């Protein structure tokens, strides 16, 4: 226990959560993002709002949180409050009336390599273009758009953990069957700024 206390003290003595966790500011923070769908809570056809319970797994390397395991008795991983570290500010762009960003700040898992894994729970009320023509035999292609709100792709780069959302924990809905799911990474360039 004393080893882990010493480690946590040594790491955060002069840590800063404002700067990006890179050796040089010209580097890009590589964040790996993976959506896990736990439950399809509701589909609101009149308001076009879909309520879902998800885990938004995020992984990145913090260059400053490395340590040598033999200095601390072989401690290879520790859990620390996510409020202390730098975090990607992923926002649900197409939020209807829910929380835009993560608000349940669970603890992250920090490994001696500086690899951080964060899997905060969130309830996403994504806006969906409900098509009602074939009601009640309709198929709804509802989507969730996740991106860093303020960081751009030349500063922080997000990559999908897998081509499809993780449904291994999905609770079966009594009203809807998920026929297909897929994740796509989109990059867009604007006439202001080629780079």
């Amino acid at each position, epitope marked *: 226990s004393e080893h882990e206390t*010493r480690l946590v003290a*040594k790491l955060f003595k*002069d840590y800063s959560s404002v700067v990006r966790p890179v050796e040089d500011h010209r580097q890009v923070v590589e964040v790996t993002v993976g959506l896990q769908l736990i439950q399809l809570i509701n589909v609101d056809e009149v308001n076009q709002i879909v309520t879902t319970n998800v885990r938004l797994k995020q992984q990145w390397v913090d260059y400053n949180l*490395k*340590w*040598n*395991p*033999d*200095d601390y008795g072989g401690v290879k991983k520790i859990h620390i409050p996510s409020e202390k570290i730098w975090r990607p500010d992923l926002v649900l762009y197409n939020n209807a009336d829910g929380d835009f960003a993560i608000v349940k700040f669970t603890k992250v898992l920090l490994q001696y390599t500086g690899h951080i894994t964060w899997t905060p729970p969130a309830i996403f009320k994504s806006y969906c273009e409900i098509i009602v023509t074939h009601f009640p035999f309709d198929e709804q292609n509802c989507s969730m758009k996740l991106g860093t709100w303020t960081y751009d792709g030349s500063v922080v780069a997000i990559n999908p953990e897998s081509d499809q959302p993780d449904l291994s924990n999905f609770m079966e809905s009594g009203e809807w069957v998920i026929k297909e799911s897929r994740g796509w990474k989109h990059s867009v360039t604007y006439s202001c700024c080629p780079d």
Partner: antibody
Amino acid sequence: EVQLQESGPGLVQPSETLSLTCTVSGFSLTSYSVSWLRQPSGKGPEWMGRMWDDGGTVYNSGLKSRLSISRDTSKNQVFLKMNSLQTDDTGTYYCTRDERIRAINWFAYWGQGTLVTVSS
Amino acid sequence: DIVITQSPSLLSASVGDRVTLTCKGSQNIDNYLAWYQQKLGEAPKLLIYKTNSLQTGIPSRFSGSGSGTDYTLTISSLHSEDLATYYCYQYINGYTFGTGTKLELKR
């Protein structure tokens, strides 16, 4: 300015406790960690343990049971005790001052080193 | 722990020659490799750390380079004072030291 002097019994019989002292000059033990290195004859050095600035200690996992380290901040000395010596423990012993960057540590200054020989 | 090997074991060189020393790990050392100089009966002296950074008061003759698994120490102009044994060591995953290379005068 910064100097470390290693001293102690150069000839030690097997099965009796080795003791070594490191004398520090030019810096305070409350601001710099001190670590002990061992170099068996005919081999590259190895790391044995560290006296932390906060007053705690850490040891090589193979030597964890054998080694004991302590310090006296009032006289700038670091002490090492080691029992159950064998002929394989013959070598040169260095105390070092350690730099830090965040949680990472490395050795920046060495003592002159004391030779310890174990023979019947 | 990461195993480290050095080559050559002995290097014969003459004053003023460009001389370079190779240190090679068994795993990614991530630029956390350091070089120190040792002389017979003298206290070893740190030359380079983080693969690139001179220790204060070391002559600018010494410069290090490398990334990933392979690292080098280079002396721009060998002086007679530089004949010594050079050890590389890494400090991200345990502490492991190379076998050392002995730098000796060509004759």
